[PDB]
Short mmCIF file of C-alpha atoms and ligand atoms in Angstrom, two decimals:
data_model
loop_
_atom_site.label_atom_id
_atom_site.label_comp_id
_atom_site.label_asym_id
_atom_site.label_seq_id
_atom_site.Cartn_x
_atom_site.Cartn_y
_atom_site.Cartn_z
CA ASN A 25 -33.89 -54.45 56.47
CA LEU A 26 -33.48 -51.59 57.75
CA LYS A 27 -30.72 -52.12 60.48
CA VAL A 28 -28.04 -53.63 57.98
CA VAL A 29 -27.85 -50.91 56.29
CA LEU A 30 -27.63 -49.00 59.23
CA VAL A 31 -25.10 -51.10 61.39
CA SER A 32 -23.09 -51.94 57.66
CA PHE A 33 -20.87 -48.37 58.37
CA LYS A 34 -19.72 -51.05 60.82
CA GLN A 35 -17.36 -51.77 57.28
CA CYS A 36 -16.08 -48.24 57.25
CA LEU A 37 -13.13 -48.38 59.83
CA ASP A 38 -10.19 -50.70 60.06
CA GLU A 39 -7.08 -51.12 62.84
CA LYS A 40 -5.79 -48.43 61.06
CA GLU A 41 -8.86 -46.22 61.57
CA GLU A 42 -9.09 -45.05 57.68
CA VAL A 43 -12.32 -44.49 56.06
CA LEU A 44 -12.59 -47.35 53.19
CA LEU A 45 -14.72 -46.14 50.56
CA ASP A 46 -16.10 -49.12 48.50
CA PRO A 47 -17.84 -49.47 52.21
CA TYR A 48 -18.96 -46.06 52.90
CA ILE A 49 -20.24 -45.88 48.91
CA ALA A 50 -22.21 -49.29 49.70
CA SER A 51 -23.90 -48.04 53.19
CA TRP A 52 -24.48 -45.11 51.23
CA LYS A 53 -26.10 -47.00 48.28
CA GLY A 54 -28.66 -49.15 51.44
CA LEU A 55 -29.95 -45.33 52.29
CA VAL A 56 -30.57 -44.42 48.67
CA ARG A 57 -32.20 -48.03 48.85
CA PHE A 58 -34.51 -45.75 51.89
CA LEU A 59 -35.12 -42.83 49.62
CA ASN A 60 -36.27 -44.70 47.05
CA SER A 61 -39.03 -46.64 49.46
CA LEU A 62 -40.03 -43.71 50.80
CA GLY A 63 -41.15 -42.01 46.24
CA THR A 64 -41.20 -39.60 44.73
CA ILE A 65 -41.53 -36.93 47.10
CA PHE A 66 -38.38 -37.64 47.97
CA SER A 67 -36.41 -38.80 45.20
CA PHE A 68 -35.41 -34.47 44.80
CA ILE A 69 -32.76 -36.11 47.49
CA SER A 70 -32.13 -39.48 46.13
CA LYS A 71 -31.20 -37.44 43.24
CA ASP A 72 -28.45 -35.88 45.12
CA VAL A 73 -27.03 -38.91 46.65
CA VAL A 74 -27.12 -41.01 43.54
CA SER A 75 -25.21 -37.40 41.70
CA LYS A 76 -22.30 -37.39 44.15
CA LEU A 77 -21.90 -41.49 44.32
CA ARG A 78 -21.19 -41.82 40.77
CA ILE A 79 -19.37 -38.55 41.65
CA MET A 80 -17.15 -41.30 44.00
CA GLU A 81 -17.59 -44.18 42.04
CA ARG A 82 -16.08 -42.84 39.06
CA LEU A 83 -12.64 -41.69 41.00
CA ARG A 84 -12.80 -45.36 42.88
CA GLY A 85 -13.37 -47.09 39.96
CA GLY A 86 -10.46 -44.65 37.20
CA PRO A 87 -7.08 -44.67 36.66
CA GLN A 88 -6.56 -43.40 39.70
CA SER A 89 -8.07 -46.00 41.46
CA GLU A 90 -5.47 -47.01 44.43
CA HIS A 91 -5.57 -43.13 45.85
CA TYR A 92 -9.40 -43.40 46.39
CA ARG A 93 -8.93 -46.49 47.90
CA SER A 94 -9.75 -44.17 51.70
CA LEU A 95 -11.02 -41.25 52.87
CA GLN A 96 -7.44 -41.03 54.45
CA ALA A 97 -5.53 -40.75 50.20
CA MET A 98 -8.21 -39.11 49.21
CA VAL A 99 -7.27 -36.48 51.10
CA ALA A 100 -3.35 -36.57 50.62
CA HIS A 101 -4.06 -37.38 47.06
CA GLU A 102 -6.40 -35.02 45.79
CA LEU A 103 -3.90 -31.66 47.75
CA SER A 104 -0.57 -32.94 46.48
CA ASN A 105 -2.03 -32.75 43.15
CA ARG A 106 -4.07 -30.11 43.37
CA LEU A 107 -7.48 -31.08 42.66
CA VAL A 108 -9.45 -28.97 45.26
CA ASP A 109 -10.69 -25.38 45.10
CA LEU A 110 -9.98 -24.28 48.19
CA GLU A 111 -12.56 -20.60 47.55
CA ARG A 112 -14.67 -20.85 45.08
CA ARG A 113 -15.18 -23.42 42.38
CA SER A 114 -13.25 -23.38 39.09
CA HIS A 115 -11.78 -26.36 37.98
CA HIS A 116 -11.96 -28.58 39.99
CA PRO A 117 -16.49 -28.25 41.13
CA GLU A 118 -16.74 -31.51 41.79
CA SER A 119 -13.22 -33.25 43.28
CA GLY A 120 -13.98 -36.34 45.61
CA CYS A 121 -13.08 -33.90 49.15
CA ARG A 122 -15.63 -31.12 48.25
CA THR A 123 -18.41 -33.92 47.22
CA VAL A 124 -17.86 -35.99 50.05
CA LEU A 125 -18.04 -33.59 52.26
CA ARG A 126 -21.18 -32.76 51.54
CA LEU A 127 -22.00 -36.88 51.88
CA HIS A 128 -20.25 -36.89 55.35
CA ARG A 129 -22.76 -33.75 56.62
CA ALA A 130 -25.92 -35.47 56.33
CA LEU A 131 -24.54 -38.57 58.53
CA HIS A 132 -24.08 -35.88 60.92
CA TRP A 133 -27.67 -34.80 59.97
CA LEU A 134 -29.00 -39.03 60.46
CA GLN A 135 -27.11 -39.31 63.31
CA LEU A 136 -29.20 -36.67 65.17
CA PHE A 137 -32.38 -37.77 63.63
CA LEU A 138 -31.88 -41.22 64.75
CA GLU A 139 -31.27 -39.92 68.14
CA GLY A 140 -34.24 -37.50 68.11
CA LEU A 141 -36.38 -41.31 67.19
CA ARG A 142 -34.42 -43.17 70.37
CA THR A 143 -35.47 -40.09 72.86
CA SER A 144 -38.77 -39.11 71.51
CA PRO A 145 -42.24 -38.97 73.20
CA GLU A 146 -44.77 -41.95 71.88
CA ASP A 147 -46.93 -39.60 69.96
CA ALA A 148 -44.06 -37.64 68.15
CA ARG A 149 -44.66 -36.95 64.53
CA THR A 150 -41.24 -37.53 62.31
CA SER A 151 -41.73 -34.68 60.63
CA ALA A 152 -40.46 -32.82 63.29
CA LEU A 153 -38.07 -34.70 64.58
CA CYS A 154 -36.78 -34.41 60.75
CA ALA A 155 -36.92 -30.37 60.95
CA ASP A 156 -35.14 -29.84 64.23
CA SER A 157 -32.53 -32.05 63.96
CA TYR A 158 -32.77 -30.26 59.81
CA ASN A 159 -32.76 -27.55 61.70
CA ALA A 160 -29.82 -27.82 63.63
CA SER A 161 -27.52 -29.24 61.88
CA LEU A 162 -27.65 -29.26 57.65
CA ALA A 163 -30.73 -26.62 57.58
CA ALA A 164 -27.60 -24.43 58.09
CA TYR A 165 -25.79 -24.90 54.44
CA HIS A 166 -28.87 -25.05 52.12
CA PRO A 167 -30.68 -21.95 50.17
CA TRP A 168 -33.74 -20.68 51.47
CA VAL A 169 -35.89 -23.10 48.53
CA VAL A 170 -33.50 -25.99 49.10
CA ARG A 171 -34.65 -25.67 53.17
CA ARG A 172 -38.44 -24.72 52.12
CA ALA A 173 -38.83 -28.02 49.28
CA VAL A 174 -36.88 -30.11 52.11
CA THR A 175 -39.69 -28.83 55.07
CA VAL A 176 -42.06 -29.18 52.96
CA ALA A 177 -40.94 -33.13 52.11
CA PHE A 178 -40.96 -33.83 56.05
CA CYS A 179 -44.13 -32.01 56.26
CA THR A 180 -45.72 -36.11 54.46
CA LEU A 181 -44.23 -38.09 57.39
CA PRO A 182 -46.03 -40.85 59.64
CA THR A 183 -46.20 -40.28 63.42
CA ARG A 184 -42.95 -41.89 65.09
CA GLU A 185 -44.40 -44.62 66.65
CA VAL A 186 -46.28 -45.35 62.77
CA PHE A 187 -42.48 -44.90 61.26
CA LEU A 188 -40.89 -46.83 64.10
CA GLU A 189 -43.34 -50.05 63.41
CA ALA A 190 -41.84 -49.50 59.76
CA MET A 191 -38.97 -50.81 59.80
CA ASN A 192 -39.82 -53.71 60.90
CA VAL A 193 -37.90 -55.08 64.16
CA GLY A 194 -40.12 -55.18 66.18
CA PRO A 195 -42.81 -53.14 68.57
CA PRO A 196 -40.83 -49.62 68.85
CA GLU A 197 -38.92 -50.05 72.10
CA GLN A 198 -37.42 -52.87 69.86
CA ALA A 199 -36.55 -50.65 66.89
CA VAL A 200 -34.94 -48.04 70.09
CA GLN A 201 -33.22 -50.55 70.14
CA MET A 202 -31.78 -51.91 67.40
CA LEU A 203 -30.79 -47.73 66.38
CA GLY A 204 -28.36 -48.10 68.88
CA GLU A 205 -26.82 -50.42 68.05
CA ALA A 206 -25.91 -48.46 65.01
CA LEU A 207 -25.23 -45.68 66.20
CA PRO A 208 -21.77 -45.72 67.63
CA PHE A 209 -20.59 -47.19 64.20
CA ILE A 210 -22.41 -44.21 62.04
CA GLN A 211 -20.74 -41.65 65.34
CA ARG A 212 -17.97 -43.23 65.21
CA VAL A 213 -17.53 -43.04 60.88
CA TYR A 214 -18.30 -39.75 61.45
CA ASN A 215 -15.74 -38.79 64.19
CA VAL A 216 -12.60 -40.15 61.83
CA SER A 217 -13.83 -37.95 58.80
CA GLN A 218 -14.37 -34.76 60.83
CA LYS A 219 -10.68 -35.04 62.61
CA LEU A 220 -9.70 -35.73 58.93
CA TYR A 221 -11.08 -33.19 57.15
CA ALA A 222 -10.32 -30.74 60.42
CA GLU A 223 -7.16 -31.39 60.14
CA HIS A 224 -6.74 -30.09 56.09
CA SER A 225 -9.19 -27.14 56.78
CA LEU A 226 -11.25 -28.80 54.49
CA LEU A 227 -14.81 -28.45 56.40
CA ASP A 228 -15.73 -25.32 54.19
CA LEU A 229 -14.85 -26.90 50.37
CA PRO A 230 -17.28 -24.81 47.98
C1 1PX B 19 -37.35 -39.88 56.62
C2 1PX B 19 -35.51 -39.34 56.48
C3 1PX B 19 -35.90 -38.06 54.95
C4 1PX B 19 -34.64 -38.25 54.42
C5 1PX B 19 -34.58 -36.49 55.23
C6 1PX B 19 -32.80 -35.42 54.49
C7 1PX B 19 -33.26 -34.67 55.01
C8 1PX B 19 -32.28 -33.68 54.24
C9 1PX B 19 -32.03 -33.75 52.48
C10 1PX B 19 -31.14 -32.97 51.85
C11 1PX B 19 -31.14 -33.18 50.56
C12 1PX B 19 -31.12 -32.18 50.23
C13 1PX B 19 -31.22 -31.60 48.72
C14 1PX B 19 -30.20 -30.78 47.79
C15 1PX B 19 -29.37 -30.48 48.22
C16 1PX B 19 -27.79 -30.14 47.60
O1 1PX B 19 -27.98 -28.91 47.17
C17 1PX B 19 -27.02 -30.33 48.51
C18 1PX B 19 -26.04 -30.26 46.96
O2 1PX B 19 -24.09 -29.58 47.57
P1 1PX B 19 -23.73 -28.92 46.12
O3 1PX B 19 -24.88 -28.35 45.38
O4 1PX B 19 -23.51 -28.35 46.87
O5 1PX B 19 -23.77 -30.00 45.16
N1 1PX B 19 -26.24 -31.63 49.15
C19 1PX B 19 -26.40 -32.31 50.31
O6 1PX B 19 -26.78 -31.70 51.41
C20 1PX B 19 -26.37 -33.48 50.40
C21 1PX B 19 -27.92 -34.29 50.90
C22 1PX B 19 -28.18 -35.91 51.12
C23 1PX B 19 -28.78 -36.32 52.45
C24 1PX B 19 -28.75 -37.88 52.66
C25 1PX B 19 -30.55 -37.86 53.20
C26 1PX B 19 -30.28 -39.08 54.25
C27 1PX B 19 -30.82 -40.08 54.37
C28 1PX B 19 -31.52 -41.21 54.82
C29 1PX B 19 -32.04 -41.30 56.17
C30 1PX B 19 -32.72 -42.37 56.03
C31 1PX B 19 -33.21 -42.36 57.79
C32 1PX B 19 -33.38 -43.31 57.73
C33 1PX B 19 -34.23 -44.14 59.28
C34 1PX B 19 -34.47 -44.79 59.54
#
């Protein structure tokens, strides 16, 4: 179920507005399952996400586990212990900070795409909704060859009508309602993460 995956972002926050890593990885694994379902054309995207989730699971499961309970703890820990490459990637190519940043940026894209689906004409193409949202967000961080591969993948997507109907939550009007319910949770996780990275000047980690 896609609704279950999207609303599971609700579990990432707590009363202290910590962004909890376990639930964050869980939600992303849900998104990976979606990506795998879409087929081999999207496999390069799934593989990159999985690669990053594995980095995070190794950090969260290892000797330093406690420091990775939340994004807030991870930032304080990696900064205190000099585990983040601020300018170019040298001895710390795969810090939790730089790794989560890539997933974070993709969450903004996901937000934009879900809003596009929600507000789109009945006769829209999902390729265009993806392209518009991508060119408006993630595209800025990807080199031309990656932007081309992404664009190619996008063009294989079906009409909006088909894409919504495939979510199996009723008529598009109801799938639109469902997206409206998940979005606030994703937006809030994004906003809290964005402020955390911004306040530590980490928005442009290499
Ligand atoms: C139908 C939706 C199709 C999914 C399209 C997602 C478009 C975004 C594609 C970006 C993938 C980029 C491929 C690899 C880029 C990497 O170089 C770069 C990593 O940097 P690094 O090299 O610095 O370590 N990676 C990134 O930018 C991370 C990209 C992760 C994108 C996650 C996409 C989320 C997929 C979930 C979609 C579910 C939609 C649900 C609608 C019901």
